[PDB]
């Protein structure tokens with residue numbers, strides 16, 4: 089039955105490198121071989137809804153995706169190294185020849201030139217019942233940040249009534265791009281206006297999880313980091329793709345999360361991280377891990393105060409435990425002062441476990457501690473802007489110093505909304 093289809097837009101180096109892990113997970117969950125485009129078997133094919141992310145053509149399955157960058161190397165090198173040539177196919181690529189040089193404004197203005205072709209591919213490919221778009225991107229560079237922002241604006245304006253969700257990577261605690269505060273503030277200002285829900289990650293938190301929860305001995309490629317983002321993307325959409333007692337769609341989760349129109353910035357977490365612990369944990373233990381800052385995929389100093397939350401239970405779930413632990417969650421986790429004791433929780437329950445695991449819980453948290461995360465971004469921004477450092481090539485590409493300032497001040501207003509709710 090037509091409907092509920094999603095189109096995924098990958099933007100810049102990080103956004104497309106993350107794409108590899110996402111589509112690899114999606115294919116595996118649906119018993120599809122990403123190298124052949126085919127089901128691995130009829131016998132292991134499951135009752136599912138492949139069409140949420142996958143297009144079934146006579147020849148096989150393809151991603152409902154666009155692979156977008158202003159320079160070609162990250163995508164081409166990725167496609168060759170991972171042998172994705174028949175899945176990340178050429179008609180799905182929108183690649184130019186010179187990057188944005190880590191400047192948001194260059195990503196935004198150069199990206200305008202490619203909007204016609206992107207809109208044409210969208211209207212050429214998508215079904216009428218498309219429910220919305222996911223935009224995958226980093227905020228610290230210039231293409232994912234500026235072109236990603238432009239895409240968020242363009243899609244929301246071109247397709248009112250469809251969802252626009254962003255999966256957005258914040259810079260690490262010490263930034264690895266000195267321009268990142270400018271790019272991050274400009275991006276979050278744009279997404280605050282045009283996105284319906286912004287799910288955030290940062291690399292400090294992701295490395296900590298991989299090193300301390302998975303105990304990987306070394307991280308040699310971003311694939312050994314991005315898999316965590318793929319996992320969050322796949323699990324929160326699982327009840328759209330597999331049977332379950334209690335399903336939920338994109339705007340349903342946003343509606344439950346967004347208490348005030350500006351509070352749309354979400355911290356995700358998942359538990360457990362391994363197959364062995366999924367066999368040896370309870371629903372209570374997994375939820376408590378999700379609410380613990382060790383499992384937050386944004387680097388936070390503490391639990392903060394939860395305004396609202398979405399919990400996806402996947403796999404071999406005792407429904408009576410899922411409900412019975414609700415009072416323990418409301419008692420043991422700090423919620424914002426205005427949250428009623430009986431509120432702040434939204435449940436999805438899906439019978440399909442992630443690959444190899446017995447069960448898994450994913451948490452999306454609308455948490456006041458994002459004000460601390462954003463304040464630290466703002467402090468970095470101010471240390472540059474107050475000295476007029478690095479502003480020249482924003483100005484040359486159409487972002488005036490006044491524009492930088494208004495983006496900063498609107499960013500500050502969102503921070504203050506979260507801090508006021510915190511109490």
Ligand SMILES: Nc1nc2c(ncn2[C@@H]2O[C@H](COP(=O)(O)OP(=O)(O)OP(=O)(O)O)[C@@H](O)[C@H]2O)c(=O)[nH]1
Nearest residue numbers: 100101102105187188190226228229230231232310
């Ligand atoms: N988690 C994660 N972070 C990434 C990845 N690739 C880049 N980054 C981070 O993203 C930021 C740099 O952004 P890029 O994606 O390289 O920039 P871009 O969008 O391609 O834009 P330009 O190169 O400036 O044109 C830095 O903070 C990197 O550490 C990735 O694949 N995964």
Ligand SMILES: [K+]
Nearest residue numbers: 101187190229
């Ligand atoms: K770069």
Ligand SMILES: [Mg+2]
Nearest residue numbers: 100101187231
């Ligand atoms: Mg790049």
